[PDB]
Amino acid sequence: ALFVHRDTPKNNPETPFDFTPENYKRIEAIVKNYPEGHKAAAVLPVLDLAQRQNGWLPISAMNKVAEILQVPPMRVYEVATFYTMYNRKPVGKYHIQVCTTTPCMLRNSDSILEAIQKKLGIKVGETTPDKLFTLIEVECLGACVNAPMVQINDNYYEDLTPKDIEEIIDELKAGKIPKPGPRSGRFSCEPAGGLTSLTEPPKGPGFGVQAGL
Amino acid sequence: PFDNTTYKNLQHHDYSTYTFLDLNLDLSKFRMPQPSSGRESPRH
Amino acid sequence: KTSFGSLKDEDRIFTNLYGRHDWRLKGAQSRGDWYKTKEILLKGPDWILGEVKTSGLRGRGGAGFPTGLKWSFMNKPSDGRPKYLVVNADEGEPGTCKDREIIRHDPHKLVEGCLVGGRAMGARAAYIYIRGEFYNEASNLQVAIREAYEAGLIGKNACGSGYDFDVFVVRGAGAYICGEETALIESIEGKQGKPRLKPPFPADVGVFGCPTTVANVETVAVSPTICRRGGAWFASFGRERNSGTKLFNISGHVNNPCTVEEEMSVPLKELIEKHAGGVTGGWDNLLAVIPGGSSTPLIPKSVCETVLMDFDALIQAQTGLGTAAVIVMDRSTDIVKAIARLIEFYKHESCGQCTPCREGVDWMNKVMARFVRGDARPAEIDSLWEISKQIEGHTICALGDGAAWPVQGLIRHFRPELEERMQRFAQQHQ
Amino acid sequence: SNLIEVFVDGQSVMVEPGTTVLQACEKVGMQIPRFCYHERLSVAGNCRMCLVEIEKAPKVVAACAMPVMKGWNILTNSEKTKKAREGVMEFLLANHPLDCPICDQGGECDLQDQSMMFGSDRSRFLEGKRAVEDKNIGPLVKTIMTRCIQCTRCIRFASEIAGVDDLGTTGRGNDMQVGTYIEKMFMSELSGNIIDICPVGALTSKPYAFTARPWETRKTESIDVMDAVG
Ligand SMILES: NC(=O)C1=CN([C@@H]2O[C@H](COP(=O)(O)OP(=O)(O)OC[C@H]3O[C@@H](n4cnc5c(N)ncnc54)[C@H](O)[C@@H]3O)[C@@H](O)[C@H]2O)C=CC1
Ligand SMILES: Cc1cc2nc3c(=O)[nH]c(=O)nc-3n(C[C@H](O)[C@H](O)[C@H](O)COP(=O)(O)O)c2cc1C
Ligand code: SF4
Ligand code: SF4
Ligand code: SF4
Ligand code: FES
Ligand code: FES
Ligand SMILES: [K+]
Structure with missing residues (x-):
């Protein structure tokens, strides 16, 4: 959680890191997405891509991103420390993030938090000794009508109870991957008592088009 | 046949970690040329 | 009309909101999307702006600014710099998840709105800044953009109108403050998501210094329907100056x-x-x-x-x-705890550039934790009100106002509850 | 001429287009309080001390970054301007450590002087203050980051004048810190000038440490002979 860096033996500028050639081609596409003279605008994706190659960002991907984009490393340090997704400390294989803002707290998300804490035997911000799960607390993740909700890696698991999140953890520990969706009856965001709107079939092309167009 | 009972957004169950970047790489061939500011960098 | 509500299904802008139909190009084109877009692009940017501003459409981001005047702000002859349209797909505000559904189940509506807006203000390209958490939604949006590119709807000679328009998707990195337009513009440029000072407005200097118009996903996706159905149909709904x-x-x-x-x-x-x-x-x-x-x-x-x-x-x-x-x-809710959690959210999501929010929001976080615990005195309450009046209006961006407003509302509507909590704590601890 | 007429407290004054409110007030002879503004650095506009009230405008504007408009009436001594100054001083002094007797900037501190002039006289902060870990940037500048007010003159000087680009703000919110993020020393040929531009006692001169006090020193204006610049 510290915003300063100390050279540990496992995290130092001499730690080996380098992009794979397919990641290099992805980097060239990303820097081609931007106008010339503004290559630093590709600092945000490319550095994230480095995390997508490693799972965490030591200070060797920071310097490599600064080197391949011709920017000072202090700007890359600012970008990595400002945003919350960039892991400057090695997290476990499955990064569980539980939303505990007010709309999710109103639908009993703390029960999910203590259920995960009891099942995994760890606390918030701790990692399992097998380096499999990392449990932290996040803000609103944009699925407030499906509260309570967690996010594991890139996937969203919504409308959960303690039994559902225990089943999610059991499926993750067995080596499988669950379905990233709400655990209740509804599919994405419809009311649980059936479709209160959009029951009629869509009209199609040319419906209601004004004259003179 | 009109059907209002199934969920058609099922492709995201099969998306990998590099799906967005490979999609951008495939899209890179369709893009128009970018404008230039006349210099390599503001520090140039 | 004086009574409003009970909207028919034929008048809905977002058909297939719940994803019950196909969200791809074949499914979107069968619902009326990408229909007669060439006529819209060829009828003129001034015609598109007039049709937008006749409908009375306001900004759906939350500010409520009239989007016709805002889009016509950058309707000016170029001076060599390109012009840009930017779509705000962050949606970090708690309780709000509509843009996720729009970009997940109707992406082609967003792409057509990007094309219509870019033709309306002469924009060179569209930069959709999606949230970092929304990985699957970003992948679906990129799939739909690729489908539109392959069919010739966007890109070089978009829809056979002679207009060249590209659509880009930029993923965020988990910052609520990056949702605001100037901080979003700085985030696209590869810097810290810290808001700029207006003036200069984004219509003068925006992303990369170029003229830029930042618009919400919802206020962009409605514009093809505005151009197709007409402005009077959109203006028929709602009260005066609240149409749609x-x-x-x-x-x-x-x-x-x-x-x-x-x-x-x-x-x-x-x-x-x-x-x-x-x-x-x-x-x-x-x-x-x-x-x-x-x-x-x-x-x-x-x-x-x-x-x-x-x-x-x-x-x-x-x-x-x-x-x-x-x-x-x-009525079974500790509302003081809810407001304290909201203030804690504002403390954790604050860019920290400017002094009043950076110190004051932490001050309200500490004093609201004390208010929840009851370890305070009633004379502090009005003092907290004054603290809110020292944050609202003295900040660079509107996160300070958005953090001061819940405290003011909680104080104004539930001062007796806070006083009862404090007197109960004073009785039980002294 | 293309000068425009603005008003400071009802007094008319001609200014060039693009002139800020602070520059117009300096032209009429009034020094608006400032922390992050510097006439040889780029405009940041984050300390919010230069907030002034324009007449018939229901929002205070930052005078260090607001260009003047024709017919604007600037009120530098109005009631809500003083209210904004007092509030910004309260926010700035909420987390500052009680370090004035053991700080080398005492007696020439900008924060002390503007707290005495434009600020209030008592504190309502009943909570605990923050503490920032000290940094090392060489044997020339003594660093106490607890006294920093995040004015970002460090990065502006190191990026625009020194041309080093080694300082920056790491973190977010109240945990935002100014530093190099690594064990690096800021050794340029113009490094010590940051000690001149820090308005607080965060960056002090290490050879000068704990030796004298500004009120008891006699100033003699002389010419440097270390080089041929003069
Ligand atoms: N949608 C969301 O996630 C959130 C929305 N909000 C809401 O958003 C609002 C605060 O956001 P802001 O962007 O600061 O709103 P508002 O102050 O800025 O202005 C909205 C738009 O109008 C433009 N504009 C306004 N006056 C102008 C002028 N004279 N000249 C040129 N352009 C002008 C601005 O550049 C901006 O693009 C509040 O209503 C708040 O409730 C707040 C938090 C989150
Ligand atoms: C702290 C903060 C966060 C914001 N987040 C968003 C957001 O996530 N999405 C959005 O569309 N607008 C957001 N806004 C509002 C924008 O400033 C701006 O109003 C919006 O991008 C465009 O508004 P429009 O609908 O009138 O075009 C935010 C504003 C603030 C102050
Ligand atoms: S009010 Fe100031 S410190 Fe707070 S988020 Fe906005 S610009 Fe940043
Ligand atoms: S910097 Fe100024 S206010 Fe802070 S301890 Fe030193 S003299 Fe006091
Ligand atoms: S150390 Fe001094 S000059 Fe540097 S940012 Fe802080 S207050 Fe400003
Ligand atoms: S409040 Fe939890 S997802 Fe929004
Ligand atoms: S001097 Fe203008 S905001 Fe600091
Ligand atoms: K100093």
Whole structure:
């Protein structure tokens, strides 16, 4: 959680890191997405891509991103420390993030938090000794009508109870991957008592088009 | 046949970690040329 | 018309909101999307701007600025720099999840809105800044963009109109403050997401220094329907200066939390009791409602009876429409804990560039934790009010106002509850 | 001429287009309080001390970054301007450590002088203050980051004048810190000038440490002979 860096033996500028050639081609596409003279605008994706190659960002991907984009490393340090997704400390294989803002707290998300804490035997911000799960607390993740909700890696698991999140953890520990969706009856965001709107079939092309167009 | 009972957004169950970047790489061939500011960098 | 609500399914902007139909190009084109777009692009940017501003469409981001004037701000001859349209797909405000549904189930509507807006203001390309958490939504949006590129709808000679328009998707990195337009512009440029000072406005200097117009996903996706159906049809709904339809996300202590499209001037009680199935324990169990997400103050049960869910009626009730995110709290809720959690969210999501928010929001976080615990005195309460008056209006961006408003609303509507908590703590500890 | 007429407290004054409110007030002879503004650095506009009230405008504007408009009436001594100054001083002094007797900037501190002039006289902060870990940037500049007010003159000087680009703000919110983020020393030929531009006692001169006090020193104006610049 510290915003300063100390050279540990496992995290130092001499730690080996380098992009794979397919990641290099992805980097060239990303820097081609931007106008010339503004290559630093590709600092945000490319550095994230480095995390997508490693799972965490030591200070060797920071310097490599600064080197391949011709920017000072202090700007890359600012970008990595400002945003919350960039892991400057090695997290476990499955990064569980539980939303505990007010709309999710109103639908009993703390029960999910203590259920995960009891099942995994760890606390918030701790990692399992097998380096499999990392449990932290996040803000609103944009699925407030499906509260309570967690996010594991890139996937969203919504409308959960303690039994559902225990089943999610059991499926993750067995080596499988669950379905990233709400655990209740509804599919994405419809009311649980059936479709209160959009029951009629869509009209199609040319419906209601004004004259003179 | 009109059907209002199934969920058609099922492709995201099969998306990998590099799906967005490979999609951008495939899209890179369709893009128009970018404008230039006349210099390599503001520090140039 | 004086009574509003009960919108028919034929008048909905966002058909296939719940993803029940195909979201790809074949499914979107069969629902009316990408239909006669060449005529829209060839009828003229001034015609598109006139059709937009005739409908009375306001900004759906939460500010409520008239989008016709805002889009016509950059309708000026070029001076060698390119012009850019930027789509705000962050949606970090608590209670708000409508843009996720728009970019997940109707991406081609967003792409067509990008093309129509870019033709309207002569923009070179579109930069859609999606949230970092929304990986699957970003992948679906990129798939739809690739499908539009392959069919010749966007890119070089877009839809056979002689106009060249590219669409780009930039993923965020998990910052709520990056949702605001100037901080979003700085985030696209590869810097820290810290807001700029206006003036200069983004229409003068925006992304990369080029002229830029930042617009919400919802206010962009409606524009092809504005151009096709006409402005008078959109202006038929809602009250005066509150025209159109709105996506409402109802959550909190309700029977069925859901996202639903409805008219602009719907009563709040009718909307909750019709689309959400009513609150838990019946309408007599309602304690408070936050109508527009965490940026807007709450209103109590007495205000909620005869309030309309548009901009003007909520401004009259000392609140705002915001993003139309209705968070409902029943009588079994520690509302002081909810407001303290909102202030803690604002403390954790704050860019920290400028002094009043950077110190004051932490000050309210500490004093609201003390208020929740009851370890305070009543004379502090008015002092806290003064602290809010030292944050609102003295900040670079509007996160300070959006953090000061919930404290003011909580104080104004529930001062006796806080005083009772403090006197109970004083009795039980002394 | 293309000069425009603005008003400071009802007094008319001609200014060039693009002139800020602070520059117009300096032209009429009034020094608006400032922390992050510097006439040889780029405009940041984050300390919010230069907030002034324009007449018939219901929002205070930052005078260090607001260009003047024709017919604007600037009120530098109005009631809400003083209210904004007092509030910004309260926010700035909420987390500052009680270090004035043991700080080398005492007696020439900008924060002390503007707190005495434009600020209030008592504190309502009943909570605990923050503490920032000290940094090392070489044997020339003594660093006490607890006294920093995040004015960002460090990065502006190191990026625009020194041309080093080694300082920056790491973190977010109240945990935002100014530093190099690594064990690096800021050794340029113009490094010590940051000690001149820090308005607080965060960056002090290490050879000068704990030796004298500004009120008891006699100033003699002389010419440097270390080089041929003069
Ligand atoms: N949608 C969301 O996630 C959130 C929305 N909000 C809401 O958003 C609002 C605060 O956001 P802001 O962007 O600061 O709103 P507002 O102050 O800025 O302005 C909205 C737009 O109008 C433009 N504009 C306004 N006056 C102008 C002028 N004279 N000249 C040129 N352009 C002008 C601005 O550049 C901006 O693009 C509040 O209503 C708040 O409730 C707040 C938090 C989150
Ligand atoms: C702290 C903060 C966060 C914001 N987040 C968003 C957001 O996530 N999405 C959005 O569309 N607008 C957001 N806004 C509002 C924008 O400043 C701006 O109003 C919006 O991008 C465009 O508004 P429009 O609908 O009138 O075009 C935010 C504003 C603030 C102050
Ligand atoms: S009000 Fe807060 S979030 Fe906004 S610019 Fe100031 S410090 Fe940043
Ligand atoms: S910097 Fe100024 S206010 Fe802070 S301890 Fe030193 S003299 Fe006091
Ligand atoms: S150390 Fe001094 S000059 Fe540097 S940012 Fe802080 S207050 Fe400003
Ligand atoms: S409040 Fe939890 S997802 Fe929004
Ligand atoms: S001097 Fe203008 S905000 Fe600091
Ligand atoms: K100093």
